[model samples]
Target: ADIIGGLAYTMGGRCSVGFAATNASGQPGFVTAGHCGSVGTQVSIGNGRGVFERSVFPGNDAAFVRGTSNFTLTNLVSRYNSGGYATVSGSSTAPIGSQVCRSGSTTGWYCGTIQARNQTVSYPQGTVHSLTRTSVCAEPGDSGGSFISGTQAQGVTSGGSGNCRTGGTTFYQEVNPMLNSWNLRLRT
Candidate 1:
């Protein structure tokens, strides 16, 4: 069947696809970094189209776009590599120092470990709290990309201070809280 993955798409700007989901009514959608767009922003995913139905940025880097057509919320997260795609099974938060990998449109696939959780980040956009820190590398367009631990869904790429060419520290907003807040369910 047709499915969705952690791919990049445009919504005012380009951001990585995090996870495919459905709201309380089982309407298909995808979640990305809230910084990518505001509510009511037009969006395109694969061959499908949608609108930013919700947003929670500055306070949190999470947003859910309610898919309108041409897409189904799939559990597969695009690996962006030879390994192909990772089927997301669950969102059990990995422990600190657990090995994790991320996929970004700008930098492709990279691995690192979770450094800390419940972190507060102050971006020029504003201050966001309760973010998870990582040793992964990401670039500008990588925001809202996918972070995975094995078959588990972790979070969406937020921001960091370094580049992939050198060591960098990245942050992610956990998926479960966003899901809970929106009453959405990840496809799996």
Candidate 2:
């Protein structure tokens, strides 16, 4: 299961990247960067089939999309486009220097180490702090991507400047608050 998003007209201008996961209520909902969608923004899942049930993109830069018939949330990460099932392993903020990897629609897959912990980044929406910094490079259309490390689920793609070529700093909203805010359960 891949959490993919793109420059969809439906989700405003913000890139929509959501991962495979269930909402707090046990309904299929993918986690993504919040700036991608607003409280009432319509979403399209499963390779842009069209029309998702509901969505919420708060200041947190994270949102959950209701899954369609074909798109189901799974506890897995990608390596060279190959899928691997991983345990959810609880949601604690990753420490700095922790090796990490991110899967994005634009970058495909790239590995990097955490740069800092509890940092704040100011995007167009607002300033979001308490974010884990990573050396993983990402670009537009990579928003709402997934970041993982050693089979442990980490955070969702927030945003960054520059592409994977020169390697830029990318910020991610930690998965713990998102899981708690939405009352969602991570797949073990």
Candidate 3:
């Protein structure tokens, strides 16, 4: 079975897979919020299994997961609309004020606009930099969810206040630096 992005997975608590990807050796895996799982934390994603290989918090909130033998990875990003999924074509960072959408296990899919870029946010988990701000509302389970612009993969939700009901803003860790830092490639 294909372990698509945006589906809820557990690392003790629950979070969503940000995007499917591979490490420098071309091994299957995915990226998600670093705060969701610690290094070497085994993930339970229904049928498939994987583990957090590396994680970076504080300065950046992201992690690179390594899929096990039974796991299958793909480029698909979950979309609730019409029950369709979008294939991630590239890791192109969108511009400020551009239209962006996010997907998570708890929230499904929500579209909003990028409000700002390269923002620093201080959270109880620690401060993070190079975060992109957005009007998209994300909750706790949405921590590692996917944020994309059109077909270009953007980043993962880091932290936010308010809710979809309250209509709040969110911040995300851009995916470009993550792919570069880990020398990983998006499945597409």
Better of 1 and 3 by TM-score: 3
Q: Number of clashing pairs, model 2? A: 5
lDDT of 3 by residue, 9-128 (tens): 887899998999989888888899999988999988877788999899988999988888566888898986537897899988788889999988887888899999989999997899
Candidate 2: segments with Cα more than 4 A from true spot: 1-18, 47-59, 68-70, 81-93
Which is better, 2 or 3, measured by lDDT?
Answer: 3
- lDDT (tens digit, per residue) of candidate 2 on 75-151: 65555444543344555556678888887766667778989867778887678777788888888877777788776
Candidate 3 ranges with C-alpha deviation above 4 Å? none
Worst 10 residues of 3 by lDDT: 79-88
Candidate 3: residue pairs that collide: none
lDDT comparison, 1 vs 2, better candidate: 1
The TM-score of candidate 3 is: 0.96
List TM-score per model, in order. Answer: 0.95, 0.79, 0.96
**Stronger candidate by lDDT (1 vs 3):** 3
Residue 65 local lDDT, model 2: 66
| TM accuracy, model 2 | 0.79
Report the error of model 3 at residue 67, Å.
0.7
